[PDB]
Amino acid sequence: TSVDCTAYGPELRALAARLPRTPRADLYAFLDAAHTAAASLPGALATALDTFNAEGSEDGHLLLRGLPVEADADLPTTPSSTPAPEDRSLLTMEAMLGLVGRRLGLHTGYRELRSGTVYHDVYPSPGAHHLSSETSETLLEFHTEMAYHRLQPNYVMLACSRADHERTAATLVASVRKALPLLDERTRARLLDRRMPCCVDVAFRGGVDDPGAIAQVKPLYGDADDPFLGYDRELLAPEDPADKEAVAALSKALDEVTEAVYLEPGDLLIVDNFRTTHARTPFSPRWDGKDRWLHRVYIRTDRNGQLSGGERAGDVVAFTPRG
């Protein structure tokens, strides 16, 4: 689902100007300012966000196009490392992630990931691990983000400050609502609410006492007529022949319903992480200071066990595997 925000430029630039200019120096105050400002988002944008937040969509994502973004020459050099300096001045796409993010829910950091930070710069880095956002030449395979984490976020938001030079990197999404109809009843029944072993990303490894402590992921769960999805192409490890068969059918159906989006500066993609897997195709970095640069945040909502009380936008949570 897409929303052309070009006409909202003036109003959005003004809302961004309401926010503290050094976000990380007091991130709780920054996100509180963004929440108050979110109540003034242009009506059609606010309605699209609230509708997506409550209902999701058949295609599993909400793409905002044409948000205000700095001209290329007016942006800093593309980052070469993580974490970001706490003194970094606010970028317009970060302001948009603050506004749009708080309209949906609570920004959340993960202790073991990206130094426990909340705003993550996504840029290519040499020798990247194959499951990493730092990849470029190799395809980043379809996966639900942190499917194995008890505190898995409802949304992953990606805002583009710079696209790759040749604009070849495409962000791919596959929605369980489009894939499900392609599966037969036997396959759906096998997957629904069925726990299967799942490895975790690099950041969360360590401390696994035995095979019994390995995370367990239900590939489909919830309402049988409109299930949530948990899938990770590389990490999910079905053991019985029937489970493998079922996961392979699910993998094929997701491939068959793949939708591609080329993020350009000013674009902000909201992925429904409980119903949609995402991936990114290959691109070749130039290592010239102007490589692809996205900003990523994770958003928790009141849906399914993400919150237990007292949480604030800006909190950083620790790891607990599902199971």
From Swiss-Prot:
2-oxoglutarate binds at R292. InterPro entries: AlphaKG_dependent_hydroxylases (IPR050411), Clavaminate_syn-like (IPR014503), Clavaminate_Synthase (IPR053503), TauD-like_sf (IPR042098), TauD/TfdA-like (IPR003819). Its EC number is 1.14.11.21. Gene3D superfamilies: Clavaminate synthase-like. Fe cation binds at H143, E145, H278. It catalyses: deoxyamidinoproclavaminate + 2-oxoglutarate + O2 = amidinoproclavaminate + succinate + CO2; proclavaminate + 2-oxoglutarate + O2 = dihydroclavaminate + succinate + CO2 + H2O; dihydroclavaminate + 2-oxoglutarate + O2 = clavaminate + succinate + CO2 + H2O. One of its GO terms (biological process) is antibiotic biosynthetic process. Pathway: Antibiotic biosynthesis; clavulanate biosynthesis; clavulanate from D-glyceraldehyde 3-phosphate and L-arginine: step 3/8; Antibiotic biosynthesis; clavulanate biosynthesis; clavulanate from D-glyceraldehyde 3-phosphate and L-arginine: step 5/8; Antibiotic biosynthesis; clavulanate biosynthesis; clavulanate from D-glyceraldehyde 3-phosphate and L-arginine: step 6/8. One of its GO terms (molecular function) is iron ion binding. Belongs to the clavaminate synthase family. This is Clavaminate synthase 1.
